[PDB]
Design an enzyme around this catalytic site. Sequence first.
Site, short mmCIF file in Angstrom:
data_model
loop_
_atom_site.label_atom_id
_atom_site.label_comp_id
_atom_site.label_asym_id
_atom_site.label_seq_id
_atom_site.Cartn_x
_atom_site.Cartn_y
_atom_site.Cartn_z
N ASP A 86 37.48 57.05 33.70
CA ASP A 86 38.86 56.86 34.17
C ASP A 86 38.77 56.89 35.69
O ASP A 86 38.44 57.97 36.23
CB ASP A 86 39.68 58.00 33.56
CG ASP A 86 41.00 58.22 34.28
OD1 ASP A 86 41.57 57.24 34.80
OD2 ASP A 86 41.42 59.41 34.38
N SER A 146 42.18 39.09 44.12
CA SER A 146 43.21 38.21 43.58
C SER A 146 43.76 37.35 44.70
O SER A 146 43.81 37.81 45.86
CB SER A 146 44.37 39.10 43.09
OG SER A 146 45.56 38.41 42.81
N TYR A 153 51.80 45.36 43.53
CA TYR A 153 50.55 44.78 43.09
C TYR A 153 49.90 44.14 44.32
O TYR A 153 48.70 44.32 44.57
CB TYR A 153 50.77 43.74 41.97
CG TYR A 153 49.51 42.98 41.62
CD1 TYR A 153 48.54 43.55 40.82
CD2 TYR A 153 49.31 41.69 42.06
CE1 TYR A 153 47.39 42.88 40.46
CE2 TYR A 153 48.15 40.98 41.77
CZ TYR A 153 47.22 41.60 40.96
OH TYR A 153 46.06 40.94 40.65
N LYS A 181 46.22 44.83 46.23
CA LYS A 181 45.14 43.86 46.34
C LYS A 181 44.85 43.58 47.84
O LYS A 181 43.67 43.41 48.20
CB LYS A 181 45.46 42.53 45.61
CG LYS A 181 45.82 42.69 44.13
CD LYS A 181 44.81 43.47 43.31
CE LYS A 181 43.35 43.05 43.42
NZ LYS A 181 42.62 43.19 42.10
#
EC number: 1.1.1.51
Lengths: 277, 277
Positions: free
Chosen positions: B65, B142, B155, B159
């Site tokens: 994790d 991304s 998000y 990134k």
Amino acid sequence: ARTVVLITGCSSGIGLHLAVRLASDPSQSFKVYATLRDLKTQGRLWEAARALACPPGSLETLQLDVRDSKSVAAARERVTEGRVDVLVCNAGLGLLGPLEALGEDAVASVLDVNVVGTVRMLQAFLPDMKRRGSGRVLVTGSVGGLMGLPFNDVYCASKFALEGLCESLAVLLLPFGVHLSLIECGPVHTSPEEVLDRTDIHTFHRFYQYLAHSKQVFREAAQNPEEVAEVFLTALRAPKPTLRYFTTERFLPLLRMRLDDPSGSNYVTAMHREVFG
Amino acid sequence: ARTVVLITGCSSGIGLHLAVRLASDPSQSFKVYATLRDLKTQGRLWEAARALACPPGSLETLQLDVRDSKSVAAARERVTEGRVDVLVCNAGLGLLGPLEALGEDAVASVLDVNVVGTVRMLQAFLPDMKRRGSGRVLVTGSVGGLMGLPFNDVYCASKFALEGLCESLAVLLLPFGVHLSLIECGPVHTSPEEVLDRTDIHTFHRFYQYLAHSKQVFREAAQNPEEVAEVFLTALRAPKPTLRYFTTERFLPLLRMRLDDPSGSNYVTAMHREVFG
Ligand SMILES: C[C@]12CCC(=O)C=C1CC[C@@H]1[C@@H]2CC[C@]2(C)C(=O)CC[C@@H]12
Ligand SMILES: C[C@]12CCC(=O)C=C1CC[C@@H]1[C@@H]2CC[C@]2(C)C(=O)CC[C@@H]12
């Protein structure tokens, strides 16, 4: 009606100079809520405020810890006008050192203050701006948010994070009348032993070189905080503000090189030579 | 000696396809440690592994994790070879919605997994690579880490954060023999009611439009995961890998426009029109 301004991180540096520049404006157009994580640090702000003779009621301090959404909500409630015309998200932390020498808590804190704390300010203050169809948000950015700097991995991570946060929000806010802008700052005038225990001798030596290089850039290029603070004011008064303002043109050539070679190879080589000669 | 590869986030998507592509390589050059946050999700990986006939001992799963530095350390200890030749930091979370509709915990989690979890992998695995003077680190990036996307504020924040983390580390790692690279991915084939309660009707309507636009881009441009996984392999075998690899050329024109107008105004306008027509 005065322009209501709420600024985070006003105990020193940019936030302190901007709060007193706005409160002392000769036109008396601004009411400033200068917020600080710990009110015991407010003395320099009040000494600077007296020196610029800010009128009584032009400047107020609130305790606001951007790590805590309850502190964010209670400072919002203390805004007696019931509106915030200009929100300045400036609270921030630096973090310098070999990545493997940084404590896990220090890493988590830089991201929580610099990135999640800005998100918490925007969640608390944006909805009312969107509903009124007006409001200005200025975010203190850095050259470290536009290009990666050795031994500033997490600090850069957090400033690049603000670029992606703000740009994503700007695409949506375009037709709402709410204006968001980053103020991109270069350097501003504002134990070896523990590091050596957590890294290798070569990395340590490179850290020394970065530090000697950094002190030299700072000594030669740091801008006065009054000059940086005035770029905030310029963005504030622009009728159609851009997403980004640059306090200086000094790093644009490095920026352009980085941006013209998407593989990143030219940037990496040029910055390694710039820092490590 | 086989190339030892440790990959995070292998329960599906890119990480699952890359782990079985490497383990099934006809040359048998790779030993893969495919890690997953919850081993109850490992069935698809084992079904894909059987389908590509990965040889016995070519693929192993570990629970890891990335929110927990103890889980990171215990997975490192399970690497029986005592070395990791290729580290793939791919574990990641998305977060989509009006910024003011996102829960504080969801925000903190995206940053902790996507950004702090990569930092925790790098702190645990980099020192040994630096000491040996060899090792490859691939990070899944991304298009959302290179340009801001509406309703993906956090998000994108996470990134963009990885771009600044990796670029900062790359400037230092240049002469150490340790190679770090981002694999820049576009879309890959891998309740209205609660959102409406947390935002205004206009923002909600814009979210609908983004979602309809997104589904259309995905339907037209999503790449197969086998094609994306092969870009990782290409970066892995390059003798002098670049900082960034792009799985597609589709978004480069948007990228170049963004990069040629540092004020951000051309980008904001072009992306608002691209998404909202
Ligand atoms: C980190 C830093 C110094 C301390 C400070 O206060 C602000 C900055 C930003 C510009 C950095 C600089 C240090 C040296 C850097 C790496 C260069 O050679 C070009 C960019 C420059
Ligand atoms: C978010 C997204 C879709 C879901 C996905 O899986 C991957 C991406 C990245 C490219 C995004 C796209 C959605 C639509 C975007 C905003 C555009 O018009 C150009 C960039 C593109």
